[PDB]
Design an enzyme around this catalytic site. Structure first.
Site, PDB file in Angstrom:
ATOM      1  N   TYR A  76      -2.308  34.620  27.881  1.00 29.78           N
ATOM      2  CA  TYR A  76      -2.755  33.425  27.234  1.00 29.78           C
ATOM      3  C   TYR A  76      -4.017  32.859  27.915  1.00 29.78           C
ATOM      4  O   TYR A  76      -4.181  33.000  29.166  1.00 29.78           O
ATOM      5  CB  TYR A  76      -1.678  32.314  27.302  1.00 29.78           C
ATOM      6  CG  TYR A  76      -0.317  32.564  26.619  1.00 29.78           C
ATOM      7  CD1 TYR A  76      -0.287  33.120  25.341  1.00 29.78           C
ATOM      8  CD2 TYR A  76       0.882  32.220  27.233  1.00 29.78           C
ATOM      9  CE1 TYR A  76       0.892  33.275  24.671  1.00 29.78           C
ATOM     10  CE2 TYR A  76       2.093  32.367  26.610  1.00 29.78           C
ATOM     11  CZ  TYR A  76       2.059  32.930  25.239  1.00 29.78           C
ATOM     12  OH  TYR A  76       3.301  33.003  24.638  1.00 29.78           O
ATOM     13  N   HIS A 126       4.150  22.117  21.308  1.00 28.75           N
ATOM     14  CA  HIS A 126       3.956  23.346  22.057  1.00 28.75           C
ATOM     15  C   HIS A 126       4.971  23.513  23.144  1.00 28.75           C
ATOM     16  O   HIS A 126       4.874  24.498  23.912  1.00 28.75           O
ATOM     17  CB  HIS A 126       2.571  23.380  22.670  1.00 28.75           C
ATOM     18  CG  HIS A 126       1.480  23.759  21.739  1.00 28.75           C
ATOM     19  ND1 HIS A 126       0.421  22.949  21.398  1.00 28.75           N
ATOM     20  CD2 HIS A 126       1.304  24.903  21.051  1.00 28.75           C
ATOM     21  CE1 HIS A 126      -0.435  23.616  20.657  1.00 28.75           C
ATOM     22  NE2 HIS A 126       0.090  24.816  20.402  1.00 28.75           N
ATOM     23  N   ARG A 171     -10.003  30.644  16.948  1.00 23.36           N
ATOM     24  CA  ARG A 171      -9.397  31.549  17.881  1.00 23.36           C
ATOM     25  C   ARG A 171      -8.406  32.508  17.135  1.00 23.36           C
ATOM     26  O   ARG A 171      -8.063  32.232  16.002  1.00 23.36           O
ATOM     27  CB  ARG A 171      -8.629  30.832  18.905  1.00 23.36           C
ATOM     28  CG  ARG A 171      -7.340  30.053  18.453  1.00 23.36           C
ATOM     29  CD  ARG A 171      -6.490  29.399  19.550  1.00 23.36           C
ATOM     30  NE  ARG A 171      -5.714  30.299  20.380  1.00 23.36           N
ATOM     31  CZ  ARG A 171      -4.414  30.614  20.178  1.00 23.36           C
ATOM     32  NH1 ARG A 171      -3.704  30.112  19.143  1.00 23.36           N
ATOM     33  NH2 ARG A 171      -3.772  31.418  21.002  1.00 23.36           N
ATOM     34  N   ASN A 220      -4.480  34.177  17.358  1.00 21.87           N
ATOM     35  CA  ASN A 220      -3.137  34.314  17.901  1.00 21.87           C
ATOM     36  C   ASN A 220      -2.511  35.573  17.255  1.00 21.87           C
ATOM     37  O   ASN A 220      -3.055  36.147  16.264  1.00 21.87           O
ATOM     38  CB  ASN A 220      -2.231  33.100  17.603  1.00 21.87           C
ATOM     39  CG  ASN A 220      -1.091  33.033  18.583  1.00 21.87           C
ATOM     40  OD1 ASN A 220      -1.305  32.807  19.787  1.00 21.87           O
ATOM     41  ND2 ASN A 220       0.133  33.321  18.119  1.00 21.87           N
ATOM     42  N   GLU A 249      -3.098  35.782  13.500  1.00 18.79           N
ATOM     43  CA  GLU A 249      -3.532  34.485  12.924  1.00 18.79           C
ATOM     44  C   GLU A 249      -4.969  34.271  13.303  1.00 18.79           C
ATOM     45  O   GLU A 249      -5.338  34.100  14.498  1.00 18.79           O
ATOM     46  CB  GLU A 249      -2.705  33.303  13.422  1.00 18.79           C
ATOM     47  CG  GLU A 249      -1.222  33.386  13.040  1.00 18.79           C
ATOM     48  CD  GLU A 249      -0.330  32.357  13.703  1.00 18.79           C
ATOM     49  OE1 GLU A 249      -0.823  31.484  14.472  1.00 18.79           O
ATOM     50  OE2 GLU A 249       0.879  32.390  13.390  1.00 18.79           O
ATOM     51  N   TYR A 257       9.471  35.128  24.055  1.00 21.15           N
ATOM     52  CA  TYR A 257       9.038  34.030  23.189  1.00 21.15           C
ATOM     53  C   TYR A 257       8.636  34.581  21.813  1.00 21.15           C
ATOM     54  O   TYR A 257       9.017  33.945  20.734  1.00 21.15           O
ATOM     55  CB  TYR A 257       7.927  33.243  23.893  1.00 21.15           C
ATOM     56  CG  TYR A 257       7.271  32.292  22.830  1.00 21.15           C
ATOM     57  CD1 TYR A 257       7.890  31.104  22.524  1.00 21.15           C
ATOM     58  CD2 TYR A 257       6.146  32.675  22.157  1.00 21.15           C
ATOM     59  CE1 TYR A 257       7.383  30.253  21.542  1.00 21.15           C
ATOM     60  CE2 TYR A 257       5.645  31.853  21.118  1.00 21.15           C
ATOM     61  CZ  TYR A 257       6.289  30.678  20.816  1.00 21.15           C
ATOM     62  OH  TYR A 257       5.770  29.874  19.782  1.00 21.15           O
ATOM     63  N   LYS A 258       7.874  35.648  21.773  1.00 17.07           N
ATOM     64  CA  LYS A 258       7.333  36.291  20.579  1.00 17.07           C
ATOM     65  C   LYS A 258       8.409  36.956  19.718  1.00 17.07           C
ATOM     66  O   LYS A 258       8.151  37.282  18.581  1.00 17.07           O
ATOM     67  CB  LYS A 258       6.132  37.186  20.827  1.00 17.07           C
ATOM     68  CG  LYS A 258       4.845  36.506  21.340  1.00 17.07           C
ATOM     69  CD  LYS A 258       3.806  37.501  21.695  1.00 17.07           C
ATOM     70  CE  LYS A 258       2.536  36.842  22.279  1.00 17.07           C
ATOM     71  NZ  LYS A 258       1.700  36.202  21.200  1.00 17.07           N
TER      72      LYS A 258
HETATM   73  C1  HEM Z   1      -3.980  21.586  16.117  1.00 14.03           C
HETATM   74  C2  HEM Z   1      -4.065  22.829  16.510  1.00 14.03           C
HETATM   75  C3  HEM Z   1      -2.838  23.581  16.753  1.00 14.03           C
HETATM   76  C4  HEM Z   1      -1.600  23.584  16.128  1.00 14.03           C
HETATM   77  C5  HEM Z   1      -1.173  22.750  14.937  1.00 14.03           C
HETATM   78  C6  HEM Z   1      -0.744  24.518  16.823  1.00 14.03           C
HETATM   79  C7  HEM Z   1       0.598  24.722  16.530  1.00 14.03           C
HETATM   80  C8  HEM Z   1       1.424  25.629  17.218  1.00 14.03           C
HETATM   81  C9  HEM Z   1       2.770  25.869  16.901  1.00 14.03           C
HETATM   82  C10 HEM Z   1       3.539  25.051  15.892  1.00 14.03           C
HETATM   83  C11 HEM Z   1       3.298  26.830  17.700  1.00 14.03           C
HETATM   84  C12 HEM Z   1       4.654  27.433  17.732  1.00 14.03           C
HETATM   85  C13 HEM Z   1       5.496  26.746  18.783  1.00 14.03           C
HETATM   86  C14 HEM Z   1       6.935  27.024  18.566  1.00 14.03           C
HETATM   87  O1  HEM Z   1       7.442  28.099  19.029  1.00 14.03           O
HETATM   88  O2  HEM Z   1       7.739  26.238  18.018  1.00 14.03           O
HETATM   89  C15 HEM Z   1       2.186  27.232  18.537  1.00 14.03           C
HETATM   90  C16 HEM Z   1       2.249  28.179  19.510  1.00 14.03           C
HETATM   91  C17 HEM Z   1       1.136  28.471  20.319  1.00 14.03           C
HETATM   92  N1  HEM Z   1      -0.051  27.763  20.448  1.00 14.03           N
HETATM   93 FE1  HEM Z   1      -0.729  26.404  19.187  1.00 14.03          FE
HETATM   94  N2  HEM Z   1      -1.466  25.039  17.839  1.00 14.03           N
HETATM   95  C18 HEM Z   1      -2.756  24.593  17.862  1.00 14.03           C
HETATM   96  C19 HEM Z   1      -3.809  24.835  18.676  1.00 14.03           C
HETATM   97  C20 HEM Z   1      -3.755  25.707  19.729  1.00 14.03           C
HETATM   98  C21 HEM Z   1      -4.865  26.089  20.526  1.00 14.03           C
HETATM   99  C22 HEM Z   1      -6.217  25.540  20.471  1.00 14.03           C
HETATM  100  C23 HEM Z   1      -4.336  26.991  21.481  1.00 14.03           C
HETATM  101  C24 HEM Z   1      -5.240  27.535  22.516  1.00 14.03           C
HETATM  102  C25 HEM Z   1      -4.855  28.319  23.315  1.00 14.03           C
HETATM  103  C26 HEM Z   1      -2.908  27.205  21.181  1.00 14.03           C
HETATM  104  C27 HEM Z   1      -2.055  28.092  21.859  1.00 14.03           C
HETATM  105  C28 HEM Z   1      -0.782  28.365  21.429  1.00 14.03           C
HETATM  106  C29 HEM Z   1       0.034  29.381  22.082  1.00 14.03           C
HETATM  107  C30 HEM Z   1      -0.472  30.265  23.246  1.00 14.03           C
HETATM  108  C31 HEM Z   1       1.241  29.490  21.418  1.00 14.03           C
HETATM  109  C32 HEM Z   1       2.320  30.485  21.603  1.00 14.03           C
HETATM  110  C33 HEM Z   1       2.015  31.606  20.606  1.00 14.03           C
HETATM  111  C34 HEM Z   1       2.505  32.994  20.856  1.00 14.03           C
HETATM  112  O3  HEM Z   1       2.835  33.419  21.995  1.00 14.03           O
HETATM  113  O4  HEM Z   1       2.471  33.838  19.891  1.00 14.03           O
HETATM  114  N3  HEM Z   1      -2.568  26.394  20.096  1.00 14.03           N
HETATM  115  N4  HEM Z   1       1.043  26.485  18.235  1.00 14.03           N
END
Ligand code: HEM
Ligand code: NA
Length: 334
Positions: free
Chosen positions: A34, A190, A220, A222, A262, A313-314
């Protein structure tokens, strides 16, 4: 647009060779970790997913049919809190403007004042309506326009130094829910993510996002994996998909395991000052992906070496050893 594909039941979705070539492979290195992987969302690479702000592809009609099915069963995948109505209209304006400019074969927009005329030739829609007047459209404005664009959307209220999940359309989530997360702030929603909080990733990311200005959007990638090309991997529907994680074998990895990416857009909405978060979801089976031998070898290394908290987590734990064993075949050094 190819013939109608399914993301449920028979899973007929497949990628053309062109859709394979433009798939947004997300791994710059042989291992994944990450980070704040944000960049300016500027047009690049004609034909790629980075060419326009909103990417419409060969799956457009299929995906809109899937969205329609999700919403028929569960209308509550779309929520707009009342203070977010203006932001919903900003979102509709942004999408229609870009889609009409970028894909003029498929969409058209003509306007005089608040008298708007939108045509979506792909879906056979011809709509004269009043911008700002919700009684002029067949449904609420966020719902109206996102029923016509690929990927999910969240609309965040920026207040008090933070971002709050106060509206969205979330029908293809990677295992989370808008109704769960509604009204939460950035670090709050988060909370389940391992590692990244202690790293500062979420502190730094919030800071960058709070400073996004009109005309300077940010993006970005994901990623995760999904068994079968299932778009609707929601908590609401877990009984329909969660068991497939137990069905992977050495012989069927190429057909079942899909890489899910994504492509995320973060863009400031000009009237409301809300932030639009686009979540454009791409899927590719591992049979299709290993057509690119460089992808194949890189994916082996990433999956073999992925930190365990991140793999858990994934959701990949249950099939990970099978997957890694299968992919070793495409890594000569291994
Ligand atoms: C407003 C912007 C964003 C929204 C609405 C959003 C929303 C979310 C949501 C809902 C989850 C899933 C959490 C869960 O398990 O319940 C998630 C995971 C994640 N978010 Fe965001 N996020 C945003 C921006 C960002 C940005 C800018 C980063 C920059 C690094 C980030 C990094 C992550 C990471 C690393 C995860 C875990 C994903 C994985 O391992 O596949 N997010 N995010
Ligand atoms: Na690095």
């Amino acid at each position: 647009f190819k013939p109608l594909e399914s993301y449920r039941e028979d899973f007929s979705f497949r990628n053309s060779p062109a859709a394979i070539a433009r798939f947004p492979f997300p791994f710059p290195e042989d291992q994944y970790m990450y980070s704040v992987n944000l960049e300016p969302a500027v047009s690049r690479d004609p034909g790629s997913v980075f060419e326009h702000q909103f990417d419409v592809d060969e799956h457009y009609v299929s995906e809109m049919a899937e969205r329609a099915r999700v919403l028929e069963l569960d209308p509550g995948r779309c929520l707009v809190m009342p203070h977010m109505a203006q932001a919903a209209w900003d979102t509709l304006a942004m999408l229609m403007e870009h889609l009409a400019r970028d894909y003029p074969q498929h969409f058209r927009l003509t306007r005089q004042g608040d008298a708007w005329h939108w045509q979506n030739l792909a879906l056979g829609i011809d709509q004269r309506f009043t911008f700002g007047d919700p009684a002029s459209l067949p449904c609420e404005p966020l719902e109206y326009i996102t029923r016509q664009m690929q990927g999910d959307f969240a609309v965040l209220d920026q207040r008090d130094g933070d971002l709050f999940m106060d509206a969205g359309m979330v029908t293809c989530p990677a295992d989370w829910s808008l109704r769960f997360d509604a009204g939460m702030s950035f670090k709050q929603w988060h909370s389940p993510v391992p590692m990244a909080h202690q790293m500062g990733v979420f502190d730094r990311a919030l800071k960058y996002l709070l400073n996004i200005q009109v005309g300077a959007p940010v993006r970005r990638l994901n990623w995760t994996l999904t068994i079968n090309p299932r778009l609707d991997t929601s908590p609401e529907t877990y009984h329909e998909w969660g068991n497939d994680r137990g069905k992977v074998t050495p012989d069927n990895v190429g057909r079942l395991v899909h890489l899910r990416v994504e492509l995320q857009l973060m863009a400031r909405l000009p009237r409301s000052n809300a932030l639009l978060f686009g979540i454009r979801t791409y899927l590719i089976s591992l049979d299709e992906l290993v057509s690119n031998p460089a992808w194949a070898q890189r994916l082996h290394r990433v999956m073999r070496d992925l930190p365990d908290p991140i793999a858990d987590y994934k959701g990949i734990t249950r099939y990970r050893q099978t997957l890694v064993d299968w992919l070793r075949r495409f890594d000569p050094e291994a």
